[PDB]
Amino acid sequence: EVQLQQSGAELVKPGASVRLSCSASGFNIKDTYMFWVKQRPEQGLDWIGRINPANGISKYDPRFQGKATLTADTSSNTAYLQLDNLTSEDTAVYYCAIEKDLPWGQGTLVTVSVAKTTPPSVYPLAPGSAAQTNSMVTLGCLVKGYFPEPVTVTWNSGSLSSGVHTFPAVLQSDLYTLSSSVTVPSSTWPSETVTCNVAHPASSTKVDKKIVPRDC
Amino acid sequence: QIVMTQTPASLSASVGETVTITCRASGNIYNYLAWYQQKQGKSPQLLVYNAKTLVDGVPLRFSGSGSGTQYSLKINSLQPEDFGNYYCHHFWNTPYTFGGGTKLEIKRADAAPTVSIFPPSSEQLTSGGASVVCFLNNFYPKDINVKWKIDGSERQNGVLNSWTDQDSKDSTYSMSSTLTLTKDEYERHNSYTCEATHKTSTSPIVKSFNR
């Protein structure tokens, strides 16, 4: 197929520099104009600058002139973006795109912080033995104490789709906390096995916790 | 450069309605404009380029127009999956700037929060922490208030609240409230109460466990 693949998430001390990569599969970079878009968390889209990889000439927005540098090499067909003297103000998702009819890249997350990586701790949320002999039951999972972003929660290995809500993470002393709920009918629980599965890539940690009834 | 000025900032409309999002370029851009929809957590999707050309694979309900400095997105017969942000982007000259956006929520009939509360996991109690959680799933509108009444007494210390975005099919919301105490304190109190007050009933939804 034809699509841009951007690089992985980054964790950097401030003042540090990064070099993000955007690959063109099934089409040639040299025939298009490529641009990069920045997006602060919860905020909107800022254009960083565009580039025509052929002649190597790039046009920036003055706000990024001394922070960003777009460079394109037609050989490996990869476009790049280098950020300098990182600061909290640069922690955001970066997008790669072509000036034509093609979907942009999935974007890259760059988290600038002194905080070291820390795997989450997932605690399973089982109810306190109350009348659960009613149509549908609501199970829960509370993932907390991890940094940086993002974690992933799925239910019963992605098979349980309908009824799940993973609420957005939130900082605390530089640590996140997130949680996910699922509504399985009363019958399936626990006549079947419902389990909360969470993957935090930044620490090569995955954790499975079996939602099981509370005792005595 | 040419500054895109977008309006309105926040918008609420129902299924079946016709909406219009307008973008006004400071300077003339001779139809060098494009519209996007950014759904939470996904890359901005292009809807229409060169002011009026609709992209292939995008519904006929999305009509684009404008001339000179005025341009506007038009959504005839709104559908539930139309919620998100819409950015009008210019590219007449450099720098190609983006408009401030439009948070488009979907008007739907009111619905009450179906709530549930969970005591702290056996596992957590040993770490020296206790998190009492409560999920108020599926309500509309978003305004809603829950108060943690510990032993019949209100506590507002160490409570984390989070909310999701409008569902794709039904347009509702969900919220998760978390009161985090130290193992010690959790052990010296009995009833824990997550009480929620919505706009669909006058008598507050209460869910609590005694421990």
Domain layout of chain B by residue ranges:
1-108, 109-211
- Distance, CA of B185 to CA of B130 (rounded, Å): 9
State how far the Cα of A52 lies from the Cα of A57, in Å rounded to an integer: 6
Please check whether residues A80 and A8 belong to one and the same domain.
yes
One domain, residues A37 and A95? yes
DSSP string, B106-150: EE---B--EEEEEPPPTTGGGTT-EEEEEEEESBBSS--EEEEES
Q: How many CB atoms lie within 10 A of CB A168?
A: 16
CA distance A162 to B129: 31
Q: Are residues A94 and A22 in the same domain?
A: yes
Nearest-CA residue of chain B relative to A63? B95
- How long is chain A? 216
| Cβ <8 Å between B119 and A144 | no
Q: How many whole angstroms separate alpha carbon B21 and alpha carbon B30?
A: 19
Q: What is the CA A169 to chain-centroid distance, rounded?
A: 11
Q: How many residue pairs bridge chain A and chain B with CB atoms within 8 Å of each other?
A: 111
Among B36, B96, B209, most A C-beta atoms within 10 A, so best to mutate, is: B96
Across the strands, what pairs with A19?
Answer: A82
* A100 and A179 both lie in a single domain: no
Q: For residues B163 and B174, give the distance between their C-alpha atoms in angstroms, rounded to a whole number.
A: 6
Sign of CA dihedral B32, B38, B42, B45: negative
Which DSSP symbol is given to A147?
B
How many Å apart are CA A70 and CA A59, to the nearest integer? 9
Q: Are residues A96 and A170 in the same domain?
A: no
Q: Which residue of A has its CA nearest to B169?
A: A162
Query: Do both A96 and A142 map to the same domain?
Result: no
Let me know whether A154 and A110 are in one domain.
no
Number of domains forming the structure of chain A? 2
Residue B47 contacts residue B39 (beta carbons within 8 Å): no
Q: Are strands B159-163 and B175-181 parallel, antiparallel or unpaired?
A: antiparallel
For residue A44, give the CATH number of its domain: 2.60.40.10
Resolution of the experimental model, in Å, one decimal: 3.0
Q: Which residue from A46, A103, A127 is facing B118, i.e. has the nearest CB?
A: A127
Picking from A80, A114, A148, the residue at the C-terminal end of a domain is A114
Both A98 and A15 in a single domain?
yes
DSSP letter at A201 equals: G
Number of H helices, E strands in chain B: 1, 18
- The arrangement of strands across the sheet holding B4-7 comes to B4-7, B19-25, B70-75, B62-67
The B-side interface with A (CB below 8 A) comprises: 38, 43-46, 49, 55-56, 85, 87, 89, 91, 94-98, 100-101, 116-124, 127, 131, 133, 135, 137, 160, 162-164, 174-176, 178, 209, 211
The answer on A120 and A101 residing in a single domain is no
Residue that terminates a domain, selected from A96, A114, A132 = A114
Which amino acid makes up residue A78? T
Which of A114, A145, A161 finishes a domain?
Answer: A114
Q: Which two tokens stand for residue A69?
A: 């540098």
Q: Rounded to an integer, what distance in angstroms lies between the CA atom of residue A191 and that of residue A132?
A: 13
Contact flag A177-B97 (C-beta cutoff 8 Å): no
Please give the Cα distance from A38 to A47 (Å, whole number).
Answer: 6
Q: Which CATH superfamily is domain B109-211 in?
A: Immunoglobulins (2.60.40.10)
> Which of B95, B124, B135 has the CB atom closest to A61's CB atom?
B95
Measured distance CA(B183)–CA(A39) in Å, rounded: 40
Q: By residue range, what is the domain housing residue A3?
A: 1-114
The answer to whether residues A82 and A160 belong to one domain is no
What whole-number distance in Å separates Cα of residue A11 and Cα of residue A114?
9
A19/A109 same-domain check: yes
Which of B44, B45, B174 is facing A165, going by the closest CB pair?
A: B174
Which token pair is A213? Answer: 């009834």
d(CA B164, CA B178): 15
Q: How far is CA B154 from CA A125, B145, B184, B188, B198, in A?
A: 23, 13, 19, 16, 18
Tell me the three state secondary structure of residue B31. Answer: coil
Mutant choice from A181, A196, A216 vs B, greatest count of B C-beta within 10 A: A181
Question: Do A71 and A105 share a domain, yes or no?
Answer: yes
Fold of B1-108: Immunoglobulin-like (2.60.40)
